[PDB]
Amino acid sequence: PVTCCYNFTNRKISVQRLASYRRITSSKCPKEAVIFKTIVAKEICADPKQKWVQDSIDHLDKQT
Amino acid sequence: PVTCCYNFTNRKISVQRLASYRRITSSKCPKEAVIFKTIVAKEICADPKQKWVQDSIDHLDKQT
Amino acid sequence: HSSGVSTQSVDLSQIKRGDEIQAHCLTPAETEVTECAGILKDVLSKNLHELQGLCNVKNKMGVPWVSVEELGQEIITGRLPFPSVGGTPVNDLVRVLVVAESNTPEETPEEEFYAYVELQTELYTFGLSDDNVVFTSDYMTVWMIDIPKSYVDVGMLTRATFLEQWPGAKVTVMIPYSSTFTWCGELGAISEESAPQPSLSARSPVCKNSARYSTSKFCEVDGCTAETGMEKMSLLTPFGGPPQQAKMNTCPCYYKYSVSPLPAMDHLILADLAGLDSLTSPVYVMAAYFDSTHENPVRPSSKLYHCALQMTSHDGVWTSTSSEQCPIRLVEGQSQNVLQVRVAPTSMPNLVGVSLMLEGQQYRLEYFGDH
Amino acid sequence: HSSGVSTQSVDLSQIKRGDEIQAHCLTPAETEVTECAGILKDVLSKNLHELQGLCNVKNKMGVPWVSVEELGQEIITGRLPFPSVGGTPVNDLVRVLVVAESNTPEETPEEEFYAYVELQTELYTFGLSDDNVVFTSDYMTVWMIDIPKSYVDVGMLTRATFLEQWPGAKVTVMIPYSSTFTWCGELGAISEESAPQPSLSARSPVCKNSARYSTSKFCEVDGCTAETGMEKMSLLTPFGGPPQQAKMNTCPCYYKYSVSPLPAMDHLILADLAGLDSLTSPVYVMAAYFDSTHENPVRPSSKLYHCALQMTSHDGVWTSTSSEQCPIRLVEGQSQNVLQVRVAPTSMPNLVGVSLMLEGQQYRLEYFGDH
């Protein structure tokens, strides 16, 4: 079941390729993470402390 | 027509393959050196400071 | 046979001045041969082969004599199967002991027993001069020298030059990978005619084409999923090898490189070994890894570490040594006839490689590179 | 063109705060980005292309765009032709400056300029995170990072990821080899379908099979004798290359490896370059060598040093810079239309290599290995 993030991507994903994101909340997981879901339904692990990740989160929240 | 030594052999030559020996004397040369002449008339540079070289000389000196 | 891999426990407490030898001859300390020469002089004059009791693992190969005519040179050279990545430029040094010896003929030879050993790397050739000598006897010489850990790895060549084809001539290189684990690479000369006799030692790049593991795309194709339990095993032991069977798992590669969500796991199996019910010596497993500390992005400190665990039989029961800093751990498998090398998923990014060493078998598992 | 090699003089005196940049941005110093950032923010704000004036040698190449539409990534990557051996693990670090940029479009794009650069080696990948940033402009970002010298060499791949196929996009790695010589490696993007367009840069192992030079046996055969003056020249400049002809000499391999007596020589010629009558930019020759100082046989301190000399044309006359420490020297040849790279015979044992850099040509001469 539960999936987690073990590595973060250091390459920014163009906002246009992002459909959504959720945050890791499970205790079974080791690292804090943001999980972006692409327009192709693919998930990529991202670092919360990074500038591009926060900006991407804003964009996604301000279009709902 | 002067030859010198630029490197020393770190490998001891069998005292039964040593014909004779001579020392570098020419001011044209850069390093102190013992030149061994093998029974096949080939010359090899040797560092006078190594013990095996001085025993080879002590031996070559006795058989003359 | 002049080839093989052997294990043994090492208790410095039951070895004459074992602590001093370890601190002054196998630890980069005084830049002078005196302290260590003085220890060996006393110890080895009482027991010529005491140094062998310090090898936790001994890997030997048979190398053919290569003849030179003019100078009286019989030369044996070989590429020792170093168990693990030596290190990163950031690491310190390792003090290794080099031993050149042979059998004593019952008939006094014409000349004295001579031997010149050298460890050459692409750029520099570390030679064991007279100034490195820490012990000498009629048919054995011991040299000491500090070399940067990064050099001690595949690439470094071992050449020993003797005057004659001494019976039983062999050169050994004692390489301490940690304070409690020394590995000895030995080169035992054989007939000029015969071909090389390599020990059953292999090096395996478990994550070839690591880019493949950047995502979970090939997870299904590789058999690395929750259902399989992130287990895709492949046989390490060749067909006609010893009665023990070792296997490696390639699924850990995903946890090391995936930026895609992976199934949550308590632990991952890097490898396991079966046949313990018939093994009569201990099994050693060594890990190479970067410490998980947070480092300055401006200057990414790359100090590589090494830890070695040991699985031993006590009254028929196999138990392992434990270690706090060590990322791996050995545990009994489904039964006492099996041992598993485990690790926590989150340790993979920093894991560089793990080596499995046991009676007649050595496997160097690397999680980087494609060669 | 979109590929090539170029040179120029670098006079910090006539460069806005050149000394400070060089000391806090091109030298491993403060382990934080504040110092270099403050300097760059003031200088590049008034002169955006200032850093170009700091590259003594510039070597560029075109590398095809490579896409990953799945994420909108436009990637370029390549293997810079490093001018010489990075170093030995005993060396310190090198503070390289990384620059990613592109032309400023006439129309405001769908997003802001972006680029992530990473320098990956066998064991570790050095990423230029935001924590490494020392300057950001609308269409240019500059990162700073300290890397162990031994890593900066062939084997280090360079990768730049963009979100658009920006015109004029290119990344540059500035690499100080000494306090006065900076070599910049550049990767310029060319159209996808395009084939790699490398610059004229070669690497030659002058002494393939160093054992061939252990004695003088092959002297006559190689044409390395007193009669010829130890000069067996071979051509470096390919057939359709620039109008400057460069040749290398293989005879010095004897002075580096021979233990047999050799003809006394005042100097050896490592290489020469003819055609200076039409060269309108300076020439640089960098040498990599170990220190001739005495070592401890128990712990040979193998630190690799780098020195670069420069031949320039002043009113039609070509003269060279000099250095009491540098084993090589540059002197005009039989006429001002030729330059020779010289060295005293006794310096070869410690000479690891020399590199020739001039307009449209770069030759890396190695006196070790077989590659």
GROMACS .gro file of N, CA and C in nm, chain D residues 163-262:
model
  300
  662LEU      N    1   1.389   2.449  -1.943
  662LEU     CA    2   1.247   2.421  -1.964
  662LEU      C    3   1.200   2.468  -2.102
  663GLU      N    4   1.293   2.527  -2.177
  663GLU     CA    5   1.268   2.577  -2.312
  663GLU      C    6   1.397   2.564  -2.391
  664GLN      N    7   1.387   2.552  -2.522
  664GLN     CA    8   1.507   2.543  -2.605
  664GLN      C    9   1.553   2.684  -2.635
  665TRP      N   10   1.606   2.751  -2.533
  665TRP     CA   11   1.652   2.888  -2.546
  665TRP      C   12   1.764   2.906  -2.647
  666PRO      N   13   1.751   3.008  -2.734
  666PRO     CA   14   1.852   3.037  -2.835
  666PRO      C   15   1.977   3.095  -2.766
  667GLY      N   16   2.094   3.052  -2.811
  667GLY     CA   17   2.218   3.100  -2.753
  667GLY      C   18   2.241   3.041  -2.615
  668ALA      N   19   2.158   2.945  -2.577
  668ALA     CA   20   2.172   2.882  -2.448
  668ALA      C   21   2.307   2.812  -2.444
  669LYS      N   22   2.373   2.819  -2.330
  669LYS     CA   23   2.501   2.756  -2.312
  669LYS      C   24   2.540   2.761  -2.167
  670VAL      N   25   2.620   2.664  -2.125
  670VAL     CA   26   2.667   2.662  -1.988
  670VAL      C   27   2.819   2.660  -1.995
  671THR      N   28   2.881   2.726  -1.898
  671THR     CA   29   3.025   2.733  -1.895
  671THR      C   30   3.080   2.701  -1.758
  672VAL      N   31   3.186   2.622  -1.754
  672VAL     CA   32   3.253   2.587  -1.629
  672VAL      C   33   3.389   2.654  -1.626
  673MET      N   34   3.406   2.752  -1.537
  673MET     CA   35   3.534   2.821  -1.525
  673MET      C   36   3.620   2.741  -1.426
  674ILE      N   37   3.739   2.701  -1.470
  674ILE     CA   38   3.826   2.620  -1.385
  674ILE      C   39   3.966   2.677  -1.363
  675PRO      N   40   3.990   2.736  -1.245
  675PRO     CA   41   4.123   2.790  -1.219
  675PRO      C   42   4.219   2.675  -1.191
  676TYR      N   43   4.326   2.666  -1.270
  676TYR     CA   44   4.423   2.559  -1.251
  676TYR      C   45   4.538   2.608  -1.165
  677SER      N   46   4.554   2.739  -1.162
  677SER     CA   47   4.656   2.805  -1.083
  677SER      C   48   4.594   2.939  -1.046
  678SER      N   49   4.667   3.019  -0.970
  678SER     CA   50   4.616   3.150  -0.929
  678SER      C   51   4.612   3.247  -1.046
  679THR      N   52   4.680   3.214  -1.154
  679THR     CA   53   4.686   3.303  -1.268
  679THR      C   54   4.634   3.247  -1.399
  680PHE      N   55   4.585   3.124  -1.397
  680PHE     CA   56   4.536   3.062  -1.519
  680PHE      C   57   4.398   3.000  -1.503
  681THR      N   58   4.302   3.049  -1.581
  681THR     CA   59   4.168   2.996  -1.575
  681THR      C   60   4.127   2.942  -1.711
  682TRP      N   61   4.083   2.817  -1.712
  682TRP     CA   62   4.041   2.748  -1.834
  682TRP      C   63   3.890   2.731  -1.827
  683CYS      N   64   3.820   2.785  -1.926
  683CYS     CA   65   3.675   2.774  -1.926
  683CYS      C   66   3.621   2.671  -2.025
  684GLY      N   67   3.541   2.577  -1.975
  684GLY     CA   68   3.482   2.475  -2.061
  684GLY      C   69   3.340   2.515  -2.095
  685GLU      N   70   3.306   2.519  -2.222
  685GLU     CA   71   3.172   2.561  -2.259
  685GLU      C   72   3.094   2.460  -2.342
  686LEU      N   73   2.966   2.447  -2.310
  686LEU     CA   74   2.878   2.358  -2.384
  686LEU      C   75   2.769   2.445  -2.445
  687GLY      N   76   2.771   2.459  -2.577
  687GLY     CA   77   2.670   2.540  -2.644
  687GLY      C   78   2.566   2.452  -2.709
  688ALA      N   79   2.439   2.487  -2.696
  688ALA     CA   80   2.335   2.405  -2.756
  688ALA      C   81   2.319   2.429  -2.906
  689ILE      N   82   2.300   2.320  -2.980
  689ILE     CA   83   2.279   2.323  -3.123
  689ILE      C   84   2.151   2.242  -3.144
  690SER      N   85   2.087   2.257  -3.259
  690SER     CA   86   1.961   2.187  -3.287
  690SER      C   87   1.965   2.036  -3.262
  691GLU      N   88   1.852   1.984  -3.216
  691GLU     CA   89   1.834   1.842  -3.184
  691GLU      C   90   1.896   1.745  -3.285
  692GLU      N   91   1.845   1.749  -3.407
  692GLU     CA   92   1.893   1.662  -3.513
  692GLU      C   93   2.043   1.673  -3.538
  693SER      N   94   2.102   1.785  -3.497
  693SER     CA   95   2.245   1.807  -3.517
  693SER      C   96   2.334   1.700  -3.453
  694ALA      N   97   2.451   1.682  -3.511
  694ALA     CA   98   2.548   1.586  -3.461
  694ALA      C   99   2.642   1.662  -3.367
  695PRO      N  100   2.696   1.594  -3.266
  695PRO     CA  101   2.787   1.663  -3.174
  695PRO      C  102   2.891   1.737  -3.257
  696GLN      N  103   2.930   1.855  -3.211
  696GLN     CA  104   3.030   1.934  -3.281
  696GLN      C  105   3.140   1.969  -3.183
  697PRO      N  106   3.233   1.875  -3.159
  697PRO     CA  107   3.344   1.896  -3.067
  697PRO      C  108   3.448   1.990  -3.125
  698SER      N  109   3.524   2.054  -3.037
  698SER     CA  110   3.630   2.145  -3.079
  698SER      C  111   3.751   2.058  -3.107
  699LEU      N  112   3.854   2.119  -3.166
  699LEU     CA  113   3.976   2.047  -3.196
  699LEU      C  114   4.060   2.030  -3.069
  700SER      N  115   4.025   1.929  -2.991
  700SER     CA  116   4.096   1.901  -2.867
  700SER      C  117   4.132   1.754  -2.859
  701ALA      N  118   4.261   1.724  -2.846
  701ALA     CA  119   4.304   1.584  -2.837
  701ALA      C  120   4.381   1.554  -2.709
  702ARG      N  121   4.395   1.426  -2.680
  702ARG     CA  122   4.466   1.381  -2.562
  702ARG      C  123   4.561   1.273  -2.612
  703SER      N  124   4.691   1.291  -2.589
  703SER     CA  125   4.785   1.192  -2.637
  703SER      C  126   4.881   1.138  -2.532
  704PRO      N  127   4.884   1.005  -2.516
  704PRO     CA  128   4.972   0.938  -2.420
  704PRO      C  129   5.107   0.919  -2.488
  705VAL      N  130   5.188   1.023  -2.484
  705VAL     CA  131   5.319   1.020  -2.547
  705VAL      C  132   5.400   0.894  -2.519
  706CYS      N  133   5.393   0.843  -2.396
  706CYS     CA  134   5.469   0.726  -2.360
  706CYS      C  135   5.389   0.595  -2.343
  707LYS      N  136   5.311   0.558  -2.443
  707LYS     CA  137   5.235   0.433  -2.435
  707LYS      C  138   5.334   0.321  -2.403
  708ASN      N  139   5.303   0.246  -2.297
  708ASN     CA  140   5.386   0.134  -2.253
  708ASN      C  141   5.519   0.184  -2.199
  709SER      N  142   5.513   0.247  -2.081
  709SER     CA  143   5.630   0.304  -2.016
  709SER      C  144   5.745   0.207  -1.992
  710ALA      N  145   5.717   0.077  -1.992
  710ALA     CA  146   5.823  -0.021  -1.971
  710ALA      C  147   5.917  -0.025  -2.092
  711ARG      N  148   5.865   0.018  -2.207
  711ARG     CA  149   5.944   0.020  -2.330
  711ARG      C  150   6.061   0.115  -2.314
  712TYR      N  151   6.051   0.202  -2.214
  712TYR     CA  152   6.153   0.303  -2.189
  712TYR      C  153   6.236   0.280  -2.064
  713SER      N  154   6.219   0.165  -2.002
  713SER     CA  155   6.294   0.132  -1.881
  713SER      C  156   6.444   0.127  -1.912
  714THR      N  157   6.480   0.088  -2.034
  714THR     CA  158   6.620   0.083  -2.074
  714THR      C  159   6.637   0.155  -2.207
  715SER      N  160   6.759   0.152  -2.260
  715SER     CA  161   6.790   0.218  -2.387
  715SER      C  162   6.780   0.125  -2.509
  716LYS      N  163   6.744   0.000  -2.485
  716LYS     CA  164   6.732  -0.100  -2.591
  716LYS      C  165   6.666  -0.052  -2.721
  717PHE      N  166   6.559   0.026  -2.710
  717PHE     CA  167   6.489   0.072  -2.829
  717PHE      C  168   6.528   0.212  -2.876
  718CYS      N  169   6.631   0.271  -2.814
  718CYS     CA  170   6.675   0.406  -2.850
  718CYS      C  171   6.697   0.425  -2.999
  719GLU      N  172   6.779   0.338  -3.057
  719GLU     CA  173   6.810   0.344  -3.198
  719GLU      C  174   6.682   0.332  -3.282
  720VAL      N  175   6.600   0.234  -3.248
  720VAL     CA  176   6.475   0.208  -3.318
  720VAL      C  177   6.377   0.325  -3.312
  721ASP      N  178   6.375   0.396  -3.199
  721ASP     CA  179   6.284   0.510  -3.185
  721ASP      C  180   6.342   0.639  -3.243
  722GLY      N  181   6.471   0.637  -3.276
  722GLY     CA  182   6.531   0.757  -3.329
  722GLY      C  183   6.558   0.855  -3.216
  723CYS      N  184   6.586   0.800  -3.097
  723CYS     CA  185   6.618   0.880  -2.979
  723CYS      C  186   6.763   0.854  -2.941
  724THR      N  187   6.852   0.929  -3.006
  724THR     CA  188   6.994   0.912  -2.983
  724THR      C  189   7.065   1.046  -2.983
  725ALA      N  190   7.191   1.044  -2.942
  725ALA     CA  191   7.270   1.167  -2.938
  725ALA      C  192   7.278   1.228  -3.079
  726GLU      N  193   7.286   1.142  -3.181
  726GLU     CA  194   7.294   1.189  -3.319
  726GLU      C  195   7.175   1.279  -3.353
  727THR      N  196   7.053   1.232  -3.327
  727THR     CA  197   6.933   1.309  -3.356
  727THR      C  198   6.901   1.411  -3.246
  728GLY      N  199   6.976   1.407  -3.137
  728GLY     CA  200   6.953   1.500  -3.028
  728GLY      C  201   6.825   1.474  -2.950
  729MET      N  202   6.788   1.347  -2.940
  729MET     CA  203   6.668   1.307  -2.868
  729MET      C  204   6.544   1.378  -2.922
  730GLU      N  205   6.522   1.366  -3.052
  730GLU     CA  206   6.408   1.429  -3.116
  730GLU      C  207   6.340   1.342  -3.220
  731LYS      N  208   6.231   1.278  -3.179
  731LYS     CA  209   6.151   1.195  -3.268
  731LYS      C  210   6.015   1.265  -3.266
  732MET      N  211   5.997   1.361  -3.357
  732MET     CA  212   5.873   1.438  -3.364
  732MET      C  213   5.760   1.374  -3.444
  733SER      N  214   5.638   1.395  -3.397
  733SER     CA  215   5.518   1.346  -3.463
  733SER      C  216   5.419   1.463  -3.470
  734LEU      N  217   5.336   1.464  -3.573
  734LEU     CA  218   5.240   1.571  -3.595
  734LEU      C  219   5.115   1.563  -3.505
  735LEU      N  220   5.077   1.678  -3.449
  735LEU     CA  221   4.957   1.688  -3.364
  735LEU      C  222   4.843   1.752  -3.442
  736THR      N  223   4.875   1.855  -3.521
  736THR     CA  224   4.776   1.926  -3.601
  736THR      C  225   4.723   1.842  -3.718
  737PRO      N  226   4.594   1.802  -3.715
  737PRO     CA  227   4.540   1.722  -3.825
  737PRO      C  228   4.543   1.796  -3.959
  738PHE      N  229   4.534   1.719  -4.068
  738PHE     CA  230   4.539   1.771  -4.204
  738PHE      C  231   4.465   1.901  -4.235
  739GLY      N  232   4.336   1.908  -4.206
  739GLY     CA  233   4.264   2.030  -4.237
  739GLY      C  234   4.258   2.134  -4.125
  740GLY      N  235   4.346   2.120  -4.026
  740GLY     CA  236   4.348   2.212  -3.914
  740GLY      C  237   4.398   2.354  -3.941
  741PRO      N  238   4.388   2.442  -3.841
  741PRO     CA  239   4.433   2.581  -3.852
  741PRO      C  240   4.573   2.591  -3.911
  742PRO      N  241   4.610   2.710  -3.959
  742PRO     CA  242   4.742   2.731  -4.018
  742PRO      C  243   4.862   2.732  -3.922
  743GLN      N  244   4.845   2.677  -3.802
  743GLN     CA  245   4.954   2.666  -3.705
  743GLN      C  246   4.984   2.518  -3.687
  744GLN      N  247   5.111   2.481  -3.705
  744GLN     CA  248   5.151   2.341  -3.697
  744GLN      C  249   5.217   2.306  -3.567
  745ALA      N  250   5.156   2.211  -3.496
  745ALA     CA  251   5.209   2.167  -3.368
  745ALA      C  252   5.257   2.023  -3.373
  746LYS      N  253   5.375   1.999  -3.316
  746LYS     CA  254   5.431   1.864  -3.311
  746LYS      C  255   5.479   1.832  -3.169
  747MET      N  256   5.475   1.703  -3.135
  747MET     CA  257   5.518   1.656  -3.004
  747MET      C  258   5.638   1.562  -3.020
  748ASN      N  259   5.721   1.553  -2.916
  748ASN     CA  260   5.840   1.470  -2.918
  748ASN      C  261   5.822   1.351  -2.822
  749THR      N  262   5.850   1.230  -2.869
  749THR     CA  263   5.833   1.114  -2.783
  749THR      C  264   5.961   1.071  -2.710
  750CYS      N  265   6.076   1.125  -2.749
  750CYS     CA  266   6.201   1.087  -2.684
  750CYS      C  267   6.214   1.115  -2.533
  751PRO      N  268   6.151   1.221  -2.480
  751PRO     CA  269   6.162   1.248  -2.336
  751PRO      C  270   6.116   1.132  -2.246
  752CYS      N  271   6.042   1.037  -2.304
  752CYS     CA  272   5.994   0.921  -2.230
  752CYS      C  273   6.115   0.842  -2.176
  753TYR      N  274   6.229   0.855  -2.244
  753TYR     CA  275   6.350   0.788  -2.202
  753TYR      C  276   6.408   0.850  -2.077
  754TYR      N  277   6.399   0.983  -2.070
  754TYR     CA  278   6.451   1.056  -1.956
  754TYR      C  279   6.357   1.042  -1.838
  755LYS      N  280   6.233   1.005  -1.864
  755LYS     CA  281   6.141   0.989  -1.753
  755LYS      C  282   6.149   0.849  -1.697
  756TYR      N  283   6.166   0.750  -1.784
  756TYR     CA  284   6.167   0.611  -1.739
  756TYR      C  285   6.296   0.530  -1.746
  757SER      N  286   6.396   0.575  -1.820
  757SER     CA  287   6.518   0.494  -1.831
  757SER      C  288   6.610   0.485  -1.709
  758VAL      N  289   6.662   0.365  -1.685
  758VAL     CA  290   6.757   0.338  -1.577
  758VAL      C  291   6.889   0.301  -1.644
  759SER      N  292   6.895   0.322  -1.775
  759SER     CA  293   7.016   0.297  -1.851
  759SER      C  294   7.073   0.436  -1.875
  760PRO      N  295   7.205   0.448  -1.892
  760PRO     CA  296   7.264   0.580  -1.916
  760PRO      C  297   7.206   0.646  -2.039
  761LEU      N  298   7.192   0.777  -2.035
  761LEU     CA  299   7.139   0.850  -2.149
  761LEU      C  300   7.229   0.966  -2.185
   0.00000   0.00000   0.00000
